[PDB]
Ligand binder design. Structure first.
Ligand SMILES: CCCCCCCCc1ccc2n1[B-](F)(F)[N+]1=C(CCCCC(=O)O)C=CC1=C2
Ligand SMILES: CCCCCCCCc1ccc2n1[B-](F)(F)[N+]1=C(CCCCC(=O)O)C=CC1=C2
Lengths: 262, 274
């Protein structure tokens, strides 16, 4: 299967490039240095970001959008909903995924997206900030903590995680297989037929292993260090879910249909 | 076949296995022999109720579990106290096992303490697995056995500390690991690096890297028929964080309902800021 593990690597990688717009390599050239991004570092660079970046897709809903930080978080959610559809599409590219019990595919997706969103979010951030709206922007890190209430402490966890994660220096070729592994997680609650999901992940894990040893001769035991990060992820996700609690001690095209889209 | 390279990782394995046997009285091997029946002299006294909870104190040695403290209006707490002194003892053994891990004592004394502070519990529940089956857990060096049901019926809060452990033990035992594997695994666990506040991550990492290499070689050599057990084992480390956190997130609650119950000092310096 030495060749059968490359076939799978190349294939996943192709679906990855086709399902995701902004890639690792991509977002990396931007973060480090033609068309520089618009940096959001304070209140005015944001108010100015609204129109300029036109990312406003998430804003136009007049009457609700009137308090900063609610509008940023609201934007964290619109792009998230977007990404879920991209993740879902990538899933179907994973050999055997489509052939599983439909309830399980939904279940795998229901619990795998949050882990996949943070993994990729790392591709878009550095110790100093995160790339937003397709790459047209860069919302600084300090500004994010500059948000108040539980808001100014929800992005700082992910920055800490991203820093450790990106240190592994993984590329799109690598992440593609990693993303799939997370999806084919046989321990998600409510699964009806775990065997098939495990066979697939294992077949995926072999390919990831071969992928990491060929692409990073230099880094000993990278396979192991990467699998360990799945721990940081679960904490990051459980933590995140807690943040969604207090944010209820906050509020709660008219909103009555927005709430239902999320 | 076998080259300079591997040969070194194999000696590390034999080295840790040997320290592990030397550090923990009740190994998985002994524990399995007790639970399965290859014995007429190792059979445990079963506790599934007060009737036998009472009987137990008689046949199987205690009052080293039940420290200076007569009884207590209810059993749920007396057990708890036991699992407390036993746990602190495990920390002790785990601590002597750590020292044997090559390079571990050569690190900054503060780092050493950090690895133990977070490693101790993940290691306790890993080993605690060895003493369990879907139906219960061995106690008192193997002399007793407390049913999974007795434990889940205990008083409202206390009858809730052990189920998650059983939940993990069953999944984890399905890996069918043995003492020689666990020794290397428990070793990787201590030598994390991503532990909070570590003053010097590099050396810690260079060590784990080697242990991971030893574990990878051990697993394939020991479970050739078990594909990706290496990765499957690493993924298990997340169930541990969750067991740990859940426990701590259960400990605090008792620190209010029971203003009269006590925590071992040590045991507090572990959970502090956990
Ligand atoms: C190929 C790209 C992979 C997709 C990455 C995952 C979704 C984006 C996301 C999640 C959290 C978060 N970000 B956030 F939502 F993007 N976000 C923002 C601002 C959002 C701007 C709109 C955008 O990026 O599309 C601020 C913190 C934060 C934090
Ligand atoms: C690295 C070493 C770790 C291996 C496992 C040793 C720790 C055992 C432990 C921890 C919690 C717990 N158990 B427990 F303590 F084993 N426990 C009991 C048994 C009480 C026995 C009382 C006696 O010793 O006489 C009941 C719940 C519980 C719950």
């Amino acid at each position: 299967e030495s060749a059968d593990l490359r076939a799978l690597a190349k294939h996943l990688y192709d679906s990855y490039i086709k399902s995701f717009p902004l890639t690792k390599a991509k977002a990396r050239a931007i973060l480090t240095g033609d068309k520089s991004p618009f940096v959001i570092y304070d209140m005015n660079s944001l108010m100015m970001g609204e129109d300029k970046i036109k990312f406003k897709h998430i804003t136009p809903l007049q009457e609700q959008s009137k308090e900063v930080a609610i509008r940023i978080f609201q934007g964290c959610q619109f792009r998230s909903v977007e990404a879920v559809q991209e993740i879902t599409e990538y899933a179907k590219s994973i050999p055997g995924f489509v052939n599983l019990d439909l309830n399980d595919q939904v279940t795998l997706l229901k619990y795998g997206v949050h882990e996949i969103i943070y993994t990729m979010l790392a591709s878009l951030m550095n110790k100093d900030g995160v790339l937003i709206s397709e790459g047209q922007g860069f919302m600084t890190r300090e500004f994010l903590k500059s948000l108040r209430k539980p808001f100014g402490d929800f992005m700082e966890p992910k920055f800490e995680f991203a820093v450790k994660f990106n240190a592994l220096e993984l590329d799109d070729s690598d992440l593609a297989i990693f993303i799939a592994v997370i999806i084919l997680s046989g321990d998600r609650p409510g699964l009806l037929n775990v065997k098939p999901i495990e066979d697939i992940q294992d077949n995926l894990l072999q390919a990831l292993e071969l992928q990491l040893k060929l692409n990073h001769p230099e880094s000993s035991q990278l396979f192991a260090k990467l699998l360990q990060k799945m721990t940081d992820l679960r904490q990051i996700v459980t933590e995140h879910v807690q943040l969604l609690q207090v944010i209820k001690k906050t509020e709660t095209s008219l909103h009555p249909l927005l709430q239902e889209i999320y």
